[PDB]
Structures are given as structure tokens and as C-alpha cells.
Amino acid sequence: ALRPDMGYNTLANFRIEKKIGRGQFSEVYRAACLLDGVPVALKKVQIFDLMDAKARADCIKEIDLLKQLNHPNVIKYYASFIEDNELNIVLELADAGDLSRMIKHFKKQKRLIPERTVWKYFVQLCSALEHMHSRRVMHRDIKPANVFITATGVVKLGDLGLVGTPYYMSPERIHENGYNFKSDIWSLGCLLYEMAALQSPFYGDKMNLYSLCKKIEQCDYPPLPSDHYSEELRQLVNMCINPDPEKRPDVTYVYDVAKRMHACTA
């Protein structure tokens, strides 16, 4: 059926086109609204038995804070509702593709990324991450697969969240301390590395869940080429993955560095 009285607040007002979202943790489909006609993507959480009352209310607690966020580099959250005992969220469409796939493109090509373009996208990201840190919200999970670039080139970021593993593990997310802001930029620091090396900084020789942690605790990661990447960057990455969080910068300083270095490369 169809009900315009509840615009964006029911799957009855959406024609799902493709399951453009991979994985079994959640299914994200690209759809088209049957009213205004704008294409939108919906995200379904199978939280019927995946979450418990104390958690269900905790998750609905976060999407509302996230709703209060208007930035051209953060994805627009249009509506939230629950039908079929599953959580539904409809946000802006990023059809062009993710940065994770954008890395793989070059990785298969065997042609590394120029220092000129990584700033072209990175600054945009920090702009967002600061806008979120301005509202005292943290992305929680910054990975190349959640940073979406449009066909035009604008940069927008995705959502947040048998041993489950975040892509970039914080040195404080190991000793089980709280996920603070200065850990949200740890993930961001490792992100800059992945664009210049096209693979995580701690991606292990013989993947080992434990040595990876000491490698994170000791900060023993493979340096980058002295020839192709500005030393401001190779020192900006090493500055953002300092184990002790106090010794790390704040988002806005990384924003400052990203901006000025973005103009020197043009």
C-alpha cells in the first residue's frame, strides 16, 4: 500500500531497487521514495533478537543525537522508524561508491595514490569529523568502507556501531577503556595511512589477533615512501596514532593541517 501521511516513515513509501549494502551485520538497500521522488538508501537492523530492551533503547538513543547534524560532508539522516520489529533508517544516497572500493581499484591497478588527491578527500573528511566533534558526537567506526564519495567528488561518511573486530582497533579499545574522541582520530590517523599505502598500517604478516595488539601498543608499523608523500603527512599519521591519547591532537588541528596542505598541492 501507500500512505503519504507518514512521509519517509514507512517502507510502504519506498521502492527498494538494489541491496547495495554488503555483509550480514546489516543490510543497506538503495531505494527511491515514491513521493518526492528523491533516491534514498534504507538501513535495516535485525534487532528483533539482536538487541535487548536496554540496548534497543540505547540504539534509538544514538540515532536521535545523530539526527541533529547538518554538514555537507556528513550523510543526511532523513527518518527513523520501527516496523516488523526491525529498525529502519533512511539516509542520503551515495551511489558512486565507497573509498574502500576506491583503494582496491588502485591496489589492483598497482598504481599508488598521489599525495595530491589524498588531501583532496581527507580535508573533506576532517571537515565532517569536526562538525560531529562540534556536536560532541563521535563516528565510533571510521573505515574506508564507510567514507562515501559521490560521482561529483564530495565526501560523506556512513554510520557507526567468533571475535568481532573493528577495522581499526584503538590502543584503548584493547584495555577496554572508553571510546573517547581522541580515539576517534586514531581510526582517522590509520585511515590516512591506508590511502597512502593502500592497506592498513598494522595488517599483519601472519595475521595474529594478539601480536597485532602489541604492534599497536608499540606503534611498530611500516613507514611510507620518503619520495612520494609529504613529510608533513608521514609525520601527521605518526602524530595521530600515538598510543597515549593525551599525546594525540584534536580533530580541528588535523583539520588545520589538512587544509593548508591541500592548497600547496594545486
Report the C-alpha gap between 52 and 66 in whole angstroms.
21
Burial of 71 (0-12, 13-18, 19+ CB in 10 A): middle
24 is in an annotated binding site: yes
Integer angstrom CA distances of residue 140 from 129, 151, 222:
11, 26, 25
Provide the 10 A C-beta neighbour count for residue 236.
22
20 is in an annotated binding site: yes
CA geometry: angle 36, 40, 44, nearest 5 deg: 130
185 is in an annotated binding site: no
218 is in an annotated binding site: no
Q: Which of 78, 71, 87 minimizes the C-alpha distance to 36? A: 78
97 is in an annotated binding site: no
Please report the DSSP string for the chain in residue order: ---GGGTTSSGGGEEEEE----SSS-EEEEEEESSS--EEEEEEE-HHHHS-HHHHHHHHHHHHHHHS---TTB--EEEEEEETTEEEEEEE---SEEHHHHHHHHHHHT-PPPHHHHHHHHHHHHHHHHHHHHTT---S---TTTEEE-SS--EEE---------SS--STTTTT----HHHHHHHHHHHHHHHHHSS-SS--TT--TTHHHHHHHHT--PPPPTTTS-HHHHHHHHHHT-SSGGGS--HHHHHHHHHHHHHS--
Give start-end residues of each CATH 3.30.200.20 domain in the chain.
1-52+76-94
Give catalytic residues, as residue numbers: 141
Query: CB-hemisphere CA count at 13 Å for 144?
Result: 20
In the numeric block, the cell 545523530 is attached to: 66
60 with 80: CB under 8 angstroms? yes
23 is in an annotated binding site: yes
Q: Specify the CATH architecture of the domain 1-52+76-94.
A: 2-Layer Sandwich (3.30)
Report the C-alpha gap between 12 and 232 in whole angstroms.
51
Report the C-alpha gap between 159 and 25 in whole angstroms.
13
Sheet of 86-92: strand order equals: 14-18, 27-33, 39-45, 86-92, 77-83
Choosing among 1.10.510.10, 3.90.700.10, 1.10.3720.10, 3.30.390.50, the CATH entry for 53-75+95-266 is 1.10.510.10
Cα–chain-centroid distance for residue 184?
Answer: 10
Q: Which three cell numbers stand for residue 75?
A: 550523510
Q: How was this structure determined?
A: X-ray
Say what the alpha-carbon torsion angle 193, 199, 203, 206 is, to the nearest 10 degrees. Answer: -150
Sheet of 147-149: strand order equals: 97-98, 147-149, 155-157
28 is in an annotated binding site: yes
Give start-end residues of each CATH 1.10.510.10 domain in the chain.
53-75+95-266
In the numeric block, the cell 586514531 is attached to: 186
26 is in an annotated binding site: yes
Q: Which three cell numbers stand for residue 88?
A: 529502519
